[PDB]
Amino acid sequence: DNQCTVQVRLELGHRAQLRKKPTTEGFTHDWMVFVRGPEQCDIQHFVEKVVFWLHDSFPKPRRVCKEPPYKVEESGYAGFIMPIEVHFKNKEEPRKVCFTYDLFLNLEGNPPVNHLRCEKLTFNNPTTEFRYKLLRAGGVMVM
Numbered sequence: 001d002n003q004c005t006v007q008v009r010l011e012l013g014h015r016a017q018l019r020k021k022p023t024t025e026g027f028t029h030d031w032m033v034f035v036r037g038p039e040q041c042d043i044q045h046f047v048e049k050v051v052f053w054l055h056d057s058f059p060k061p062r063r064v065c066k067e068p069p070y071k072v073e074e075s076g077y078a079g080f081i082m083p084i085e086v087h088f089k090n091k092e093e094p095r096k097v098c099f100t101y102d103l104f105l106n107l108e109g110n111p112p113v114n115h116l117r118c119e120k121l122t123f124n125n126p127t128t129e130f131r132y133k134l135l136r137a138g139g140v141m142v143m
């Protein structure tokens with residue numbers, strides 16, 4: 001009767017390509033990982049920050065974006081599993097969502113990687129305040 005659900009969408013993704021020539025440090029690959037909304041949505045209305053947890057070998061592996069673009073650009077030698085936390089401008093639970101992101105590179109001879117992973121978040125009965133932030137960002141009421 002006073003029940004209420006807001007869906008929003010997140011796109012996580014990454015690009016990777018073999019450098020024509022490795023770096024001095026033997027980095028064979030360029031890559032880029034990101035969190036964005038669909039086109040014409042503004043996830044910054046409900047997203048406080050995004051944290052990208054790189055392999056422990058990276059300098060400052062806890063990479064934070066407090067505003068768009070939410071992305072890391074790097075070079076490296078191998079793929080890994082990257083925890084990505086999306087923190088919300090939410091007073092209550094849930095405050096964040098954690099994704100296990102497969103950052104995989106192209107094996108030499110294979111063309112560049114260009115992957116997208118679409119995530120639908122369903123917020124049940126958000127506070128009036130946080131409901132407003134979700135709708136500002138291009139979220140939708142359901143149910």
Ligand SMILES: C[C@H]1CCCN1Cc1nc2ccc(NC(=O)c3ccc4c(cnn4C)c3)cc2[nH]1
Pocket residue numbers: 027055057058059073074075076077078079080
């Ligand atoms: C462009 C500049 C901006 C600051 C730093 N970056 C250069 C730069 N500094 C690095 C330090 C470490 C690594 N490590 C890896 O590439 C890496 C990936 C997967 C791995 C391992 C070991 N096991 N597995 C599964 C290592 C990459 C780096 N790239």
